[PDB]
Each structure stands twice: as structure tokens, then as C-alpha cells.
């Protein structure tokens, strides 16, 4: 008996460092079941997609280092994916039905007995207020208002990498709780990329 801990996973911070490094373009215990607990009963022995709000193309449940803590981020993992098409002409079609069923499934998982509401990002940072992501040279900034309040269409801003069409599977989500009342308000999160990558490395350790 010795414990896993995805919230203090030094692996995450090592891979974080080197993805950052790469972005200047310009043994191991695996566990099977989980959630990053202490004891792991069954013991064996990576897309650096930069994105916010949503997780794309990953392992396919909700996890938080502390749910009582509104400041802590909620990583969400889906039992079924949702295909999202994105075009260089500047928008994203998305199945309205397929998307609506998803929110309410996440909504029952959140009730763990009260009202659940999803609202747009509180404001401030453009790469966070929008569902943003890179996609082969280009970088999309799409208003996800319609997403977080038979196709749904999302307007997109697009920048090529000048600083110094692609389809996708939606693996999961990043969420923030308004923790200040008989209502729990959830808004789209992101920013700390380490969360993207412990979303995937939850079931690993080093010893």
C-alpha cells in the first residue's frame, strides 16, 4: 500500500515544462479501475493540444483536488464524445441535440439536489473567455456563449502563429464554480495547462 496523487503529480510539471520549451518553436506505476486516490487496487507497470474550456482528443466522471473549494478546477471526462467541426472560414458547427444531452448529463453528476446552471466566462482573458485551441498552424478563438448557456454555429476568430479546416472529438471539459443561495453556477475554465495534462496522467505514478 502506497498512494497515487494526480493533484501532486510531479510528472505533470515535468511534461508541462517541456511542452512550454517546445513552444519556443517561434519506473512507472499504471493503475486500472480511479480518480487519483490514495490506494490503487489494480496495478500494471499524449496530445500537447493547447486549449481552454474543452479537452480535445484524449482518454475517454468528474475530478477535483477539492470540490468544496470554488477556486479549484473541475476536470470533466465524458463517457461519449461530441464531434465538433471547425473551418478556416471562421466558424464551428456542432450538433445541438448531441450537445444539449451532454450538459444535462454533467448536470446530474453535479447535483452530488439543487439547481444547476451553466453561464459564460466571467470576463477578462480572450484565450479563456472563448473556447480557444491551436489546429495546425492556426489558432481559433470561438465564442462559446451558445455552448454554455440541427446545428449550433459558433463564430470564430483565427490567428496564424505570427508573434515573435479541422474536425475534433470533445474528450472533456474544464469548469469553475461560483462559490459565494440555492443555486450552483458553473462557468467555463482553463488557463493552467497542467490541468489539461493531469486530465490524462491521472492514472500514473513514479516510484
Amino acid at each position, epitope marked *: 500500500t502506497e498512494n497515487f496523487n494526480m493533484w501532486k503529480n510531479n510528472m505533470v*510539471e515535468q511534461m508541462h515544462e517541456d511542452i*512550454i520549451s517546445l*513552444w519556443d518553436q*517561434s519506473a512507472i506505476l499504471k493503475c486500472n479501475d480511479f480518480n487519483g486516490t490514495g490506494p490503487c487496487t489494480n496495478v500494471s507497470t499524449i496530445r500537447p493540444v*493547447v486549449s*481552454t474550456q474543452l479537452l480535445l482528443n484524449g482518454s475517454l466522471v468528474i475530478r477535483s483536488e477539492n470540490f468544496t473549494n470554488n*477556486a479549484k478546477t473541475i476536470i470533466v471526462q465524458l463517457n461519449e464524445s461530441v464531434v465538433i467541426n471547425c473551418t478556416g472560414a471562421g466558424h464551428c458547427n456542432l450538433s445541438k441535440t448531441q450537445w444539449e444531452n451532454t450538459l444535462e448529463q454533467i448536470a446530474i453528476k453535479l447535483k452530488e439536489n439543487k439547481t444547476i446552471i451553466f453561464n459564460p466566462s466571467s*470576463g*477578462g*482573458d*480572450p*484565450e*479563456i*473567455v472563448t473556447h480557444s485551441f491551436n489546429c495546425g498552424g492556426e*489558432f481559433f478563438y470561438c465564442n462559446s456563449t451558445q455552448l454554455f448557456t440541427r446545428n449550433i454555429t459558433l463564430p470564430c476568430r483565427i490567428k496564424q502563429i505570427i*508573434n*515573435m479546416r479541422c474536425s475534433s472529438n470533445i474528450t472533456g471539459l474544464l469548469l469553475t464554480r461560483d462559490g459565494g443561495n440555492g443555486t450552483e453556477i458553473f462557468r467555463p475554465g*482553463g*488557463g*493552467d*495547462m*497542467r490541468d489539461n495534462w493531469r486530465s490524462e496522467l491521472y492514472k500514473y505514478k513514479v516510484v
Partner: antibody
Amino acid sequence: QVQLQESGPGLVKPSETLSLTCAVSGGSIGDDYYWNWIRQSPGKGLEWIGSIYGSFGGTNFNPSLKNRVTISMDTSNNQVSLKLNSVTAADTAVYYCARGSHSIVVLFGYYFDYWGQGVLVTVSS
Amino acid sequence: ALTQPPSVSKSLGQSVTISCSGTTNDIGAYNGVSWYQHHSDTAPRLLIYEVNKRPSGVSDRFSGSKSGNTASLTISGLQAEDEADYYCGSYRSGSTWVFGGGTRLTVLG
């Protein structure tokens, strides 16, 4: 590349509203930059108050000033504004206006490359 | 905030290193550390951005590094024009931005 000039009342009474303005020349505030307010009180160090992002008007605040700060942008006149409510003498300070530049914020943040000269504001009776 | 020693003294010609100690949510979460020179009656001048990059033109004497939750600025061949206040700062998770407490550099000789 861009000039900034702060201005506003030099004296404010306690509990009243401090109001300042930055006039930006040489570029447009509707562009892809953060426009920041920063201050320094005599003896103390720098303190970020908040930012507004040109593209859509979204704001960020210092968590300990949030309850009494607003920031706006005037796209004609090309100006950014600070309103700080319910002041006290602890709000006496030099107020700076600064532009925030960035590559990808989620990996590299942003940084303050152009600053105005600052305007002194004194809270007193 | 982020912690720096309040004051350091060196001499003309020497090197100095100013440490900024931050947290897992600023310096350890981003390569977003910036350093600022501040002379009296002048606005703060950007020195280092994105841990180690420089604008033109701040000399080669200035350089920034990062280690875990701690960043550093080093100044070589101290000239008299370097007697200033020095500030480190960083973007921080939850869309906030935070400055260090400041280091007041004295240059002897």
C-alpha cells in the same frame, strides 16, 4: 510604437470616487492588447489594479480591489478609464497606465511594454 | 504577492542576482515572468519578458531565468545607471496579475 498619457483630479476626499483617464496615441485601443492600471503608493511597491482587453472589453481585477474598481474603454476618443470607489488615504499613489502585450497568454502570460508617466492622486480632507 | 529581498548592495563592475520567489500558480504555472527597472521620476522600464527574452534595446548584461516557483534576474558589469528599484512580476491563474515587493539596488564605487 505607442504613447500613453494619464490624467484626472489631483485631489480626492475620503469615501469619494477617484476617476482617471489614459489617452492612447499612435495605436488603437480596439486592438489585441491589455490596457492596465498600475499604482505605487509612497514607500510601497508596484500594484496591479486591473486590465481591460481591447478586442471585446473584458476585465480582470486585483482580487482585493474587485469590490470597488471599474475599468472602461472609449473606442472613440481612444481612451481607457479607471474608477476606484470609496477611497481612503491608502489610495494615495502615483497611478500608471500600461499596455499589455502577449503571444499565447496561457503559456507565457502577458507583460507591460509601454507605460505612461503616471499621475499623482492624493486622498485627503 | 511575490517575495524579493528588499535591498542588495554590490559594487561597480560586479554582477548581482535578484531572486523572485513565487507560487505554483504564477511562476510555476507559466513562463510569464517579467522584470522591470524603475528609476525615480521615470516610468518602470520593461527589462525581461517571458522568463528570459529582452526587448531591443536592453543590454546583454541583463538576463532572466526560472527554477520551479522561483525566478531570477542577473546584472553584469554594474554601471551607475543601474542603481534602481527592480520588480519581478507574473500572470497568475484565475486571470489576475501580480508584482513582487521590489528590490532596491545600491551601486558602490
